[PDB]
């Protein structure tokens, strides 16, 4: 009886699972590592902190490697509950990484929201929300400290920590553009909130201190890091009103080995609004009662998972005049691509298409090299926007090729592509391996 009985029944089907054993699961041998310590140190920010200002900071070289950066803001909410939507990230309009005077990467507030929307997942994204928004029904006048961790090639895995010890001839610094309009803090929609306080900002950096033997090697040896960077230019949508399904052919300006492309259709006035507004609970301000208005979101619930409020009908990517795949409807790119590739959920209005088997990882797993492709395009088909957004009977009870009339507000198009490059460090100087 028991486990012995199971061991007794050993025969031919076990020879390829256990015969001449190679591993065991019950005697795991750990690896020994190089001594290091982690410290978070604050730096000096050069520039005036405030709405609409540009500030930058040089990373004080207080360690051997840089593994992470967390930007902190202190905000006072200028409106009532449910009037904010990731305000720490809207404020963090753009973060640029410079090494030795050359631009390495750039990440926009909308990218942070898009990355959060389709790549970050679990309780980890809820906790992310906790760090950047008001999540407990807080009231006007509440003061909260917010944390916005950066998502550069070096921020999530220590194996890509910045080798500042080996960059004694170059400065490493980042530039920060702060938004002038932050929803629920100094504006409500387009209307200014009188008396709104100016943000307080600091940047914290996690330094690695290495021991004698390893820091000697890092300082003396040349290094090569295989890294990811974000390419981005904003564009314009082609959303129709009635009787037609608009087409758009977007000429792409991406190059280097791309692991995925992702995009969203947004209302440029309302940060994070990737869908149409409608008189459905959580779909607009006042939704569900007579005061419902479909021109303004119930901001704290700006994001939705109802794809019927998304504007995209179908998409295709074409390379050098021949289709990269046969046309899929928008829901494929919103629901299936992230299931197959990252294993998460993407909200309505945000779409992904991947080339990588695991685009969320750093280990290369398939890329499209857009430096050896002469003409790449993104072909979009839009839904017809004829449904009256103020009637839930018409929005919750309709078909796939139509959406709300309010989808026409999604006038700004953001297409992101992430790709590989190599960061070379030689003779105390760093720089990129491949141009364009």
């Amino acid at each position: 009886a028991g486990g012995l009985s199971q061991l007794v029944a050993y025969g031919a089907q076990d020879v390829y699972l256990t015969g001449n054993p190679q591993i065991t699961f019950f005697k795991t041998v750990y690896r020994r590592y190089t001594n290091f310590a982690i410290e978070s140190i604050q730096q000096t920010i050069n520039g005036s902190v405030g709405f609409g200002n540009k500030v930058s900071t040089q990373i004080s070289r207080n360690g051997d490697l840089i593994t992470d950066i967390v930007v902190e803001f202190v905000l006072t909410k200028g409106g009532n509950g449910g009037t904010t939507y990731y305000p720490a990230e809207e404020l963090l309009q753009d973060v640029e990484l410079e090494i030795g005077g050359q631009r390495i990467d750039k990440h926009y507030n909308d990218w942070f929201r898009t990355y959060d929307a389709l790549f970050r997942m679990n309780d980890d994204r809820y906790n992310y929300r906790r760090m950047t928004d008001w999540v407990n029904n807080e009231l006007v006048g509440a003061q909260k400290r917010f944390y916005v961790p950066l998502i550069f090639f070096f921020n999530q895995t220590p194996g890509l920590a910045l080798p500042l010890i080996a960059l004694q001839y170059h400065e490493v610094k980042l530039y920060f553009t702060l938004a002038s309009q932050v929803q629920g803090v100094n504006y409500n929609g387009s209307s200014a909130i009188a008396g709104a306080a100016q943000p307080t900002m600091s940047v914290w950096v996690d330094y690695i201190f290495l021991d004698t033997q390893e820091r000697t090697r890092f300082a003396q040896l040349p290094h090569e890091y295989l890294i990811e960077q974000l390419q981005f230019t904003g564009s314009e949508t082609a959303t129709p009103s009635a009787t037609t399904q608009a087409s758009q052919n977007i000429r792409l300006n991406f190059n280097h080995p791309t692991k995925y492309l992702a995009w969203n259709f947004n209302n440029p006035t309302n940060y994070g609004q990737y869908t149409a507004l409608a008189n459905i609970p959580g779909a607009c301000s006042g939704a569900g009662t007579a005061a419902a208005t479909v021109t303004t979101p119930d901001y704290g619930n700006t994001g939705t998972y109802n794809e019927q409020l998304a504007v995209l009908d179908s998409a295709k990517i074409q390379l050098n005049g021949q289709d990269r795949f046969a046309t899929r409807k928008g829901s494929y790119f919103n629901k299936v691509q992230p299931y197959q590739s990252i294993g998460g959920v993407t909200p309505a209005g945000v779409y992904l298409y991947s080339f990588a088997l695991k685009p969320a990882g750093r280990q290369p797993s398939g890329t499209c090299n857009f430096s050896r492709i002469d003409n790449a395009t993104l072909s979009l088909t839009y839904k017809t926007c004829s449904i009256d957004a103020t009637s839930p009977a018409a929005v919750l009870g309709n078909t796939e090729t139509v959406t709300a009339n309010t989808a026409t507000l999604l006038t700004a198009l953001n297409i992101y592509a992430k790709n590989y490059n190599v960061l070379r460090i030689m003779s105390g100087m760093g720089g990129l391996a491949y141009a364009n």
Partner: protein
């Protein structure tokens, strides 16, 4: 006697006098009898029950 005496100075009271040393020579017994692990079929059984021919 007055100024050449011994005392306890910090650094001489370091916790490593415990954390570098085991309790093992203090808690272990002296056991001369070897361990008796043996073949599994001797206890488990001989699988004598008409297994399918392939």
């Amino acid at each position: 006697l007055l100024r050449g005496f011994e005392s306890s100075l910090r650094g001489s009271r370091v916790r490593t006098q415990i954390d570098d040393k085991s309790f093992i020579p203090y808690t272990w017994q002296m056991i001369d009898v070897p361990l008796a692990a043996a073949k599994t079929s001797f206890i488990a059984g001989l699988d004598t029950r008409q297994q399918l021919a392939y």
